[PDB]
From TrEMBL:
<dbReference type="InterPro" id="IPR011992">
    <property type="entry name" value="EF-hand-dom_pair"/>
</dbReference>
<feature type="domain" description="EF-hand">
    <location>
        <begin position="31"/>
        <end position="66"/>
    </location>
</feature>
<feature type="domain" description="EF-hand">
    <location>
        <begin position="165"/>
        <end position="192"/>
    </location>
</feature>
<dbReference type="GO" id="GO:0005509">
    <property type="term" value="F:calcium ion binding"/>
</dbReference>
<dbReference type="Pfam" id="PF13499">
    <property type="entry name" value="EF-hand_7"/>
</dbReference>
<dbReference type="InterPro" id="IPR002048">
    <property type="entry name" value="EF_hand_dom"/>
</dbReference>
<keyword id="KW-0106">Calcium</keyword>
<dbReference type="InterPro" id="IPR018247">
    <property type="entry name" value="EF_Hand_1_Ca_BS"/>
</dbReference>
<protein>
    <submittedName>
        <fullName>Mnemiopsin 1</fullName>
    </submittedName>
</protein>
<feature type="domain" description="EF-hand">
    <location>
        <begin position="132"/>
        <end position="158"/>
    </location>
</feature>
Length: 195
């Protein structure tokens, strides 16, 4: 029933490197509780209180429909999404229960911090750089605001949210999100509190 190294990849990883981190729900702010549960319920397509990989993969598959990405780009995105949500606690067999979702998110965040400290690759960056190429339907090597709006549409976010996020991440002022700026955006969208 409770998350640990036997049923959650992020606990598995922390314990493998001696990280003693423990979850305390009192640490999670109300905004983040609100956003996490809303994300769960949006992802939980059948409203059974469980998140499964099949439900998670509906969204990148909708992204694929809205662009014309290469088969290998699409396969990189599929792989990245699978790895990301596995490390977020979505067992490919057991899924993940609503009541463990907040905790699954917070142990994943500690595991990304441990990775950072250890110079190991960020899984958020992996997810962002795989989506990058799929979003870049132009072929121009970058993501422009229309390319980001398409992502909003695939995710049932109103296409006007794109202008906000884009402005905040294009600190370059290039009119494009280069790969570090989409990382920045994905770190917020998929983990960190909004500033
Ligand atoms: Ni940044």
């Amino acid at each position: 029933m409770p998350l640990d190294e036997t049923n959650n990849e992020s606990y598995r990883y922390l314990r493998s490197v001696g990280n003693t981190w423990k979850f305390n729900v009192e640490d999670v702010h109300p905004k983040m509780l609100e956003r996490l549960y809303k994300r769960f319920d949006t992802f939980d397509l059948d409203t059974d209180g469980k998140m499964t990989m099949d439900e998670i993969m509906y969204w990148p598959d909708r992204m694929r429909q809205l662009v014309n990405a290469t088969d290998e780009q699409v396969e990189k995105m599929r792989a990245a999404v699978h790895t990301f949500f596995f490390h977020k606690g979505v067992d490919p067999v057991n899924g993940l229960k609503r009541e463990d979702w907040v905790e699954a998110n917070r142990v994943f965040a500690e595991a990304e911090r441990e990775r950072e400290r250890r110079g190991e690759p960020s899984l958020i960056a992996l997810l962002s750089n795989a989506y990058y190429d799929v979003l870049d339907d132009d072929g121009d090597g970058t993501v422009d605001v229309e390319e980001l709006k398409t992502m909003m549409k695939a995710f049932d976010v109103p296409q006007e949210a794109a202008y906000t996020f884009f402005q905040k991440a294009d600190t370059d002022k290039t009119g494009k999100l280069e790969r570090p700026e989409l990382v920045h955006l994905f770190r917020k969208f998929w983990m960190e509190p909004y500033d």
